[PDB]
């Protein structure tokens, strides 16, 4: 897969193992030089974001191309597989390594190889089994928020209730006397004041435990390997079940199977096949990232402490109360049982190959595979609950289908012709192809749990319309790629492509790319032997790639249906047009040096790069007068210049007592070149960011000064005005200017430790991201005296400027805050991702017993230590803006392995 | 190995080949209109006026318009593919209507030149379609002008703006960036278009679901009154005011069952199609309505001030339909003009609070003529019509005198987005901080002060251009000084 010119990283099986999480890519955080991965949600259904080296484009996508065992899969599929099936991961980060691929190799590729059993002559059989829990890392946000009657006096004094009123009037009965609500519901009419107080200005309640729980996670695996003469097999079966820590229900669980096989038929033919598949239930909590009165992390902070969602037994009630409400608002558990959900995905993956070697040098190899995934999903609104709008139920049934099939057959003729004139010439073709599908039906008016079939629905004004979506694309690419040798020190290799894609028009779909690079073995030529220097290689390459991941139909001038009446159809205009849409084209220049010392037990590599995106694909924002929102267009250009460096060591202190260490680092600087309609800058509306031809991609706000100790008002620096630095008090649109931070963090990488003894082990992997900023949108609410005064706020609003109090810096009560710099936080962090502690059982304990011959014991922990700069739960979960967020998780595992 | 893939569902844009094609694109336009000249879109210019105050239930959804939070109203709204709302959305949907209509109007004109139609009957129907497209072209530009160009009576502005209109695009041209044209240009365009259609639309309305000549005159009358052309306003209103009877009611209950029925109410001159499964919508912004079984319960984010309640005589039918004493079960009033049309219920027993898109009812043409007549000195036909409308509603008016025209137009058009524009022609400053809140709702609807004052001629009575067209086009003169 890898070339000798290019840059490449490889992760072992050891790092892809356990990690109690469906998202495998979470394990590569701060683990490859220039591979910036972030998971923006603590949801088990979540999949991480990956940018290799830079952010590639402004419109088109930048995630790397994911390839498992030769066919392009997707992080969604990869999560239905079993990681104990994964042998290694290779990250191909320059442009000479990614020269046989063709879809979005501009962002690198990521290559997963599955285990195939070593041949030997006996058989191995391993058994894994671990258990653990998810908790929640940050509590600091609620360490300083007003209490029960702390914010009442805050509310009374600012006359939010009444013009002149006393704290007791405001409760004595205004809301303690909305027991009139509870007495209209037969359930709770005579349990208000008995078992259930939903308002109480004394013992204020714990809204965090009301909305988040400690949730168990469980997995286990059995797997067989072995082989014989010329034939090998791998085989595994396993299960996984992780439950989300949010009380709002979320979870992920799969049942995994895998059978891998390859065999030498004769000395002219040899074939293989590896088959996988699973059965998975994913349910995703999705009131997160949105502002709703009593839900999410936003809820745990904003909900007043005088609202009590517990019965007198410290157990969650079915329903709580606000003030002025019509219908009592239901809690997230009771909501869940009145509103069920289930999905079931039936995933299948077949892969086969055939190698044919007619005459010495050439190796003809045909490969094919297929990926089928039928998912099926049901959801109901349960009839008859007292706390609903109507008492009639409903049911929705969906039916998805995805079928992508690929072929890739090559023909490689290597052969020498000297002793110091090696050569290889490779060349084949690919053909990917995809078809998708969705079907949905809805029915309403149900009057009983037992009679909720979809065909037992009401018939009139109750009928709905079905759902339907259809999607398909294809790719046809031909490639070639030669390698050259001269003696044993100099390597030269040159490659060339031709890509067509269905995403572009009939006169614009093809595009040729080529790579050229070389390596010099400075140790096997100019320094033949040494006393301290093991190996030393200098390499360099340059190539053009291609990016295509946008949408399947983004280039046609199209009309859809807009129906007016019920007795004939109507047509409206749907999409703008662009016949000239074609490939976004990138280019890389990599120059690199690798070395190893002591005894090839102290290694390190350094690469420098320049990545240029030309003929870019932007979803160009259009002026509203045009009538559309966007249109993709080949427009603009961009640059990412940076360097990464890795190094591994071996400080082993004994002879049986090993000590390991490794570290990682990358810095990328971004720079935009051309934009759209001839502009030099473009603010993204309502986001706080700007694309200026100037430098990277940076935040766009108003520099916040403070308050006027004289008037209590708010101040802002004025852009471009100095004193012989100007401040104003009337916020203007034109008070906003490019701040010199940057959305995509610029420094990525981590470092890991390692140790040992006689069996006992301890390992620690750290990762960091520095230079990452975010807008704490939650503080727009918890930190203002201008509005949203129903909600609980930070204790600091108890010092707002008055006339009797004037030596603080929290402004007078009457004003609302703006999205300026009191909201830009430094969301930089260092995480202690894993912390294992294994103990492989003594080899001498399996003496007479010819049944075993292996054992181990775990005691893991993930994300247990985090260095908070950010003032709001988790600084990873966001980027650009940090909303009602679903924090990441902390886990305590404990595994056990039995080997025989 | 052929590999172009086209989408199921969509078709290519082509010139109009056949009458039937023309007729279909024509419905898509009338289909697009229903989600544009729509009551939800005018609830913004309603709340900004001097009638409401915000309750403790608001989560900063209305307060920016009710209390003039200028730091929010500058950028306000969204118009992506997830949401379309607020000032940005208002700006967007109307420009889309002008653009999609421009495509209809032009392609039908092209179809006529190439002689694509078959007989005289097609060609005639074609021409009347073309006239309908011209009325909608006109509606779109004026609805954009009402909110985005300054009244001729404004104090401080941004240098260059005080006599400008909107970016005026008379052809399907989505790839245009230019500068705003003058007021004199847009107003001649709106007005010529209306007149070019009146010479062609038939004298008698053919369907209440399609632009008719009766709609056209009523629209022009509405526009002239905004311009102040009180003379021409009255003379177009006269052409139609007599063709639509007012509602005949014996008590409040009888009134409610007719005003709330899109299909019966004989005052409606043009409305967009509606069934329970296509074209209904909730519009619960102003009343806070929510079904509870087969009842209806309320929790509004704005209730009117006390003085809005006090315009209505207790025996006025509208003081239980247009507004209704349902806040805190029975202690205060909210604006219930958009409660329901029961014909759109899924199940007859059960409320679903769905209504339809109404485009012009006759009560407005009455109040246009009374006010124009008062200015042009025609007191005969000015109490004839003012007393008629006031009496058919339950409380006939004491004196006919323009001070009573002001209170009566306010009484009839509440919730319909006309008070802000009116209080600019009548030279009324805000005074929100001075009014008294409803005494029945204490602890619920409390007094919240302004965040910017609104004396006469303040620039913020006009909305600011959305920062998508500012950012994308620095050749555009913005409106606010800030």
């Amino acid at each position: 897969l890898s070339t000798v010119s290019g840059s490449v990283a490889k992760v072992s099986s050891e790092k892809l193992a356990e990690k109690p999480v469906a998202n495998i890519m979470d394990a590569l955080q701060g683990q490859v030089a220039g591979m910036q991965v972030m998971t923006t949600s603590g949801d088990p259904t979540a999949v991480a974001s990956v940018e290799i080296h830079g952010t590639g484009s402004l419109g088109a996508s930048s995630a790397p191309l994911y390839i498992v065992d030769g066919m392009q899969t997707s992080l969604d599929v990869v999560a239905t597989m079993n990681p104990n099936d994964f042998e290694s991961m290779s990250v191909l980060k320059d442009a000479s390594a990614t020269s046989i691929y063709g879809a979005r190799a501009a962002n690198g590729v990521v290559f997963i190889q599955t285990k195939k059993g070593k041949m030997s002559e006996r058989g191995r059989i391993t058994f894994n089994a671990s258990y653990g829990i998810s908790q929640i890392l940050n509590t600091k946000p609620l360490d300083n928020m007003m209490t029960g009657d702390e914010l009442l006096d805050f509310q009374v004094k600012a006359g939010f209730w009444g013009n002149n009123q006393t704290v007791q009037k405001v409760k004595d009965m205004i809301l303690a006397g909305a027991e009139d609500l509870y007495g209209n519901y037969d359930s709770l009419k005579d349990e208000y004041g008995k078992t259930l107080f939903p308002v109480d200005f004394n013992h204020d309640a714990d809204w965090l435990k009301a909305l988040f729980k400690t949730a168990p996670t469980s997995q286990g695996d059995i797997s067989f390997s072995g082989g014989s003469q010329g034939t090998s097999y791998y085989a595994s079966i396993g299960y996984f079940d992780q439950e989300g820590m949010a009380r709002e229900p979320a979870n992920f669980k799969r049942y995994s199977g895998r059978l891998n096989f390859e065999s030498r038929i004769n000395e002219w033919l040899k074939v293989g096949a590896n088959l996988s598949g699973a059965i998975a239930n994913r349910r995703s909590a999705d009131y997160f990232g949105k502002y709703y009165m009593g839900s999410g992390t936003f809820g745990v902070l904003t909900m007043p402490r005088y609202y009590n969602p517990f019965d007198v037994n410290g157990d969650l009630a079915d329903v709580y109360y606000m003030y002025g409400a019509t219908r009592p608002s239901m809690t997230e558990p009771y909501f869940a049982k009145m509103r069920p959900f289930s999905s079931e995905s039936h995933q299948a993956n077949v892969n086969g190959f055939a190698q044919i070697t007619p005459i010495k040098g050439l190796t003809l190899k045909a490969q094919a595979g297929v990926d089928i995934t039928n998912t099926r999903t049901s959801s109901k609104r349960m009839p008859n609950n007292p706390y609903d709008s109507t008492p009639l139920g409903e049911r929705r049934e969906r039916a998805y289908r995805d079928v992508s099939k690929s072929f890739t057959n090559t023909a490689e003729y290597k052969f020498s012709i000297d002793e110091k004139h090696d050569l290889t010439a490779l060349m084949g073709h690919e053909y990917i192809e995809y078809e998708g599908d969705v079907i949905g039906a809805s029915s309403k008016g149900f009057e009983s749990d037992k009679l909720m079939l979809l065909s037992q629905g009401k018939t009139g004004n109750s009928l709905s319309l079905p759902e339907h979506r259809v999607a398909e694309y294809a790719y046809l690419s031909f490639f070639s790629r030669f390698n050259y040798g001269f003696d044993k020190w100099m390597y030269i290799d040159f490659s060339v492509r031709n890509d067509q894609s269905s995403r572009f028009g009939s006169n614009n779909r093809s595009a040729w790319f080529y790579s050229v690079g070389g390596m010099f073995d400075i140790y096997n030529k100019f320094i033949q032997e040494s006393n301290w220097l093991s190996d030393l290689r200098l390499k360099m390459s340059y190539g053009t790639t291609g990016n295509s991941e946008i949408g399947n139909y983004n280039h046609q001038a199209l009309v859809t249906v807009n129906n007016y009446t019920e007795d004939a159809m109507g047509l409206s205009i749907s999409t703008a047009g662009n016949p000239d849409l074609s490939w976004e084209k990138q280019s890389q220049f990599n120059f690199g040096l690798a070395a190893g010392a002591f005894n090839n037990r102290l290694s390190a590599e350094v690469d420098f790069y320049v990545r240029t995106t030309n003929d870019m694909l932007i979803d160009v924002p259009m002026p509203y007068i045009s009538g559309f929102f966007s249109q993709y267009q080949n427009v603009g250009s961009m640059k990412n210049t940076g360097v990464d460096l890795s190094l591994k060591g071996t400080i082993y202190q004994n002879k049986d007592w090993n000590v390991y260490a490794s570290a990682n680092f990358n810095y990328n600087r971004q720079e935009i070149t051309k934009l759209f309609f001839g502009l030099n800058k473009y603010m993204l509306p309502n986001t706080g960011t700007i694309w200026e031809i100037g430098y990277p991609n940076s935040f766009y706000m108003a520099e916040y000064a403070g308050i006027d100790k004289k008037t209590g008002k708010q101040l802002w620096y004025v852009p471009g005005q100095v004193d012989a630095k100007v401040t104003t008090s009337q916020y203007s649109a034109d008070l906003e200017t490019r701040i010199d931070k940057s959305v995509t963090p610029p420094i990525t990488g981590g470092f890991s430790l390692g140790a040992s003894w006689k069996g006992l082990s301890l390992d620690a992997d750290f990762a960091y991201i520095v230079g990452k900023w975010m807008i704490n949108n939650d503080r727009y609410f918890t930190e203002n005296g201008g509005g949203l005064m129903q909600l609980n706020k930070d204790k600091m609003l108890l010092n707002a400027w008055t006339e009797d109090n004037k030596e603080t810096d929290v402004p007078k009560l009457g004003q609302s805050p703006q999205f300026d710099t009191h909201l830009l936080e430094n969301a930089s962090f260092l995480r202690l991702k894993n912390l294992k502690l294994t103990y492989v059982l003594p080899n001498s304990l399996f003496a007479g017993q010819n049944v075993i011959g292996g054992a181990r014991v775990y005691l893991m922990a993930r994300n247990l230590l985090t260095v908070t700069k950010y003032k709001g739960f988790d600084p990873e979960a966001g980027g650009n803006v940090g909303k009602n967020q679903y924090p990441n998780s902390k886990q305590y595992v404990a595994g056990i392995q039995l080997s025989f | 190995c052929e590999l172009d893939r086209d989408p199921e569902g969509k078709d290519f844009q082509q010139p109009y080949t056949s009458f039937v094609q023309t007729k279909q694109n024509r419905d898509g336009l009338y289909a697009l209109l229903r989600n544009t000249e729509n009551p939800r879109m005018h609830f913004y210019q309603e709340l900004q006026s001097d009638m409401y105050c915000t309750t403790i239930t608001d989560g900063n959804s209305l307060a920016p318009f009710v209390n003039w939070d200028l730091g929010i109203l500058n950028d306000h709204g969204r118009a992506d593919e997830d949401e379309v709302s607020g000032i940005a959305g208002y700006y967007f949907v109307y420009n889309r209507l002008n653009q999609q209509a421009n495509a209809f109007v032009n392609n039908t004109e092209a179809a006529l030149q190439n002689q694509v139609y078959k007989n005289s009957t097609e060609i005639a129907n074609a021409k009347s379609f073309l006239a309908e497209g011209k009325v909608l072209q006109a509606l779109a530009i004026w609805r954009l002008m009402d909110r985005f160009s300054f009244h001729e009576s404004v104090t401080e502005v941004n240098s260059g703006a005080k006599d400008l209109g909107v970016i005026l695009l008379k052809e399907y041209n989505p790839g245009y960036i230019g500068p705003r044209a003058t007021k004199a240009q847009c107003y001649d365009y709106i007005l010529s278009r209306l007149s070019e259609a009146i010479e062609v639309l038939p004298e008698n309305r053919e369907s209440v679901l399609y632009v008719s000549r009766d709609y056209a005159y009523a629209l022009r009358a509405r526009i002239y009154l905004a311009l102040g052309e009180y003379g021409k306003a009255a003379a177009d209103a006269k052409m139609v005011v007599d063709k639509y009877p007012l509602i005949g009611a014996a008590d409040a209950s009888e009134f409610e069952n007719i005003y709330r029925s899109d299909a019966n109410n004989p005052e409606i001159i043009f409305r967009g199609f509606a069934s329970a499964t296509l074209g209904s919508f909730t519009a619960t912004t102003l009343n806070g309505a929510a079904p509870a079984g087969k009842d209806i319960k309320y929790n509004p984010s704005a209730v009117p001030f006390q003085w809005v309640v006090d315009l209505y005589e207790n025996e006025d039918f509208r003081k239980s339909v247009y507004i209704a004493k349902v806040v805190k079960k029975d202690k205060g009033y909210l604006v219930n003009k958009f409660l329901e049309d029961k014909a759109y219920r899924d199940v007859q027993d059960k409320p679903n609070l769905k209504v339809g898109a109404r485009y012009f009812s006759v009560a407005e043409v009455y109040l246009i003529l009374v006010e124009s007549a008062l200015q042009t000195g025609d007191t005969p036909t000015a109490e004839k019509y003012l007393k008629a409308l006031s009496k058919a509603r339950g409380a006939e008016v004491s004196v006919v005198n323009m001070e009573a025209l002001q209170a009566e137009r306010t009484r009839e058009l509440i919730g319909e987005g006309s008070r802000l524009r009116d209080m600019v022609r009548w030279s009324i400053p805000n005074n929100h901080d001075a009014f008294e809140t409803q005494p029945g709702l204490e602890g619920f609807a409390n007094t919240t002060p302004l965040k910017a004052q609104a004396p006469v001629g303040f620039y913020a009575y006009t909305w600011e251009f959305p920062q998508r067209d500012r950012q994308t086009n620095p050749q555009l003169i913005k409106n606010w000084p800030i």
Binding site: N686, T687, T689, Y780, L788, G879, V881 | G59, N60
Partner: peptide, 13 residues
């Protein structure tokens, strides 16, 4: 309710 007080809209995810 649904308190859209500010809610600055994500531009990067």
């Amino acid at each position: 309710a649904s308190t859209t007080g500010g809610n600055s809209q994500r531009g990067s995810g």
